[PDB]
């Protein structure tokens, strides 16, 4: 019956604040410390801090000191996280989680140190884009050749080859998100070499959000 209901995903500008909420039910709200933890790319889970619902006392992890504020509204059983001055490093999934057991002050703190029930997570992306069309570059060369579809926002992009005629050996990779907050992907085709120079290869890129339709010949 223990449930933690988090607010949803968000897209935020660098320099904005992130505010998320977590509503608790199925237990006596004031008896349990609440933790916030995030899952950030290239990093594992990262503990952010805890809050005591009794008097609102908190403890913040070192890296969030001076930019994190955890609060609570007891009358609505709701917990709030406010994270200030966002950067690209704050793109992550944010979780609230309940401590295992109430604290017995001066006697036992063991239950404070375990995350037992978890919110569903708030998937956050920090980007100051703004719709933006990609720049397309050839990836010059069985041999492998491609197109780099660089710096667009938002998803998606579609790539075909030779006006749709070429499909075998085509591998269009999932996009990466750069610290600029812009997406890039590559599409690669593996062609019989000897057909090289004999055959022309053109990638046809479409980014509907910005209404860009680019053809790029790969020499």
């Amino acid at each position: 019956q223990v449930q933690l209901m988090q607010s949803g995903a968000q897209l935020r500008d660098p320099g904005d604040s992130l505010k998320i909420s977590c509503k608790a039910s199925g237990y006596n709200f004031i008896d349990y410390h609440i933790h916030w933890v995030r899952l950030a790319p290239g990093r594992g889970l990262e503990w952010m801090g805890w809050i005591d619902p009794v008097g609102g006392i908190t403890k913040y992890a070192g890296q969030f000191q001076g930019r994190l504020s955890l609060t609570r509204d007891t009358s609505t059983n709701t917990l709030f996280l406010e994270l200030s001055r966002l950067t690209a490093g704050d793109t992550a999934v944010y979780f609230c989680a309940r401590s295992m057991r109430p604290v017995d002050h001066g006697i036992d703190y063991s239950g404070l140190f375990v995350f037992h029930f978890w919110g569903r997570g708030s998937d956050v992306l920090v980007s100051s884009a703004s719709t933006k069309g990609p720049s397309v570059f050839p990836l010059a060369p069985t041999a492998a050749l491609g197109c780099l579809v660089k710096d667009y926002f938002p998803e998606p992009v579609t790539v075909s080859w030779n006006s749709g005629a070429l499909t075998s050996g085509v591998h269009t990779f999932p996009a990466v998100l750069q610290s600029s907050g812009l997406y890039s992907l590559s599409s690669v085709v593996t062609v019989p070499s000897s057909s090289l120079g004999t055959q022309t290869y053109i990638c046809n890129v479409n980014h509907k959000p910005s209404n860009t339709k680019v053809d790029k010949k790969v020499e």
Partner: protein, 212 residues
Amino acid sequence: SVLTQPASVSASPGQSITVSCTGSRNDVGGYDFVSWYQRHPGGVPKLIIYEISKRPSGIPQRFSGSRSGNTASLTISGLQDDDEADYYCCSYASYDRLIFGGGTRVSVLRQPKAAPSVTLFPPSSEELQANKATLVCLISDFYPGAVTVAWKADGSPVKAGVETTKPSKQSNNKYAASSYLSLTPEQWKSHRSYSCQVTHEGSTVEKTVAPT
């Protein structure tokens, strides 16, 4: 601080694996408050072990935890498909801190291991003329879906400007990933080579490109 875990481990159904979590006397070694969390791709973390070796409700005894010195270990016997996940250790740290490990991908092998095909592209002439440079490392057809990528400029490690994707399941149940190194053109032309190094199941594949 980040407790140190291996990047990945794998085994077949019915077998056992162990994941280590190495910390210090001010955390794993200093207190009996070590816990482990299981997280499925796209999923929510779930508590598996607490106080080093205790199991909460709903966890079968084939999951077990231990500690030796500053290193905690999670062992999973009788591996099942549901066990494929990222596992994170966590410890209390003095004073009034909690710290996580970097996570370990446990894979439950359901087809043979397959090493990654790696293709590295240098920056295009057109991109350089736009006063920018990107190296593109494409990684395909590997199984199971766990890799790490490191970049070298000449003989040295390069950490700045690297963005790497998570593995994505392909149609054929193998995986694909990619890594991008963003450089200034000056930076690109100032070295004699750049390398993309892809590690998978303990072996590293390396591709190299040169500005000249």
